């Protein structure tokens, strides 16, 4: 909510 | 029709522009320049209506 976190979808 | 379909606005946060301007300024930090002291009191709450 306070710290945005993104991730790789399927290139992993 | 414009009002009912435009629910967002792509504005960069004001602090970032403040930092940019402070870096671009050719004046000492401690001395007073009115340009940097005029945009400090600016708010962007009503960007959507404009």
């Amino acid at each position: 909510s306070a710290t945005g976190g993104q991730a790789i979808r399927n290139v992993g | 029709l414009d009002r009912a379909f435009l629910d967002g606005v792509g504005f960069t946060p004001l602090a970032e522009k403040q930092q940019q301007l402070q870096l671009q300024l050719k004046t000492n930090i401690l001395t007073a320049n009115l340009i940097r002291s005029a945009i400090n009191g600016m708010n962007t709450e009503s960007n959507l209506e404009v």
């Binding site: 945005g4 976190g5 991730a7 | -």
Partner: protein, 75 residues
């Protein structure tokens, strides 16, 4: 220290959490998942961390404020 719990003392919030520090827009991905490490006695997970980033070097760039200022003082 006993009188603190006897009285209403303690139980107050700290001062560190008052200051607001944090990051935004963090990108996160899976660890390597291989186990070859020179420290074979340690746990499996610690070995997995070591291979992904490699061995630490120069023992100074890593902050460790116990010894960083001591090195600065020596120099």
């Amino acid at each position: 220290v006993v009188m603190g719990i006897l009285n209403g003392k303690l139980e107050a919030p700290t001062v560190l959490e008052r200051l607001n520090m944090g990051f935004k827009y963090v990108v996160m991905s899976d660890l390597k998942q291989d186990d070859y490490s020179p420290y074979s006695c340690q746990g499996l997970q610690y070995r997995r961390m070591l291979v992904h980033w490699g061995l630490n070097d120069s023992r100074i760039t890593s902050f460790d404020p116990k010894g960083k200022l001591q090195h600065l003082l020596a120099k």
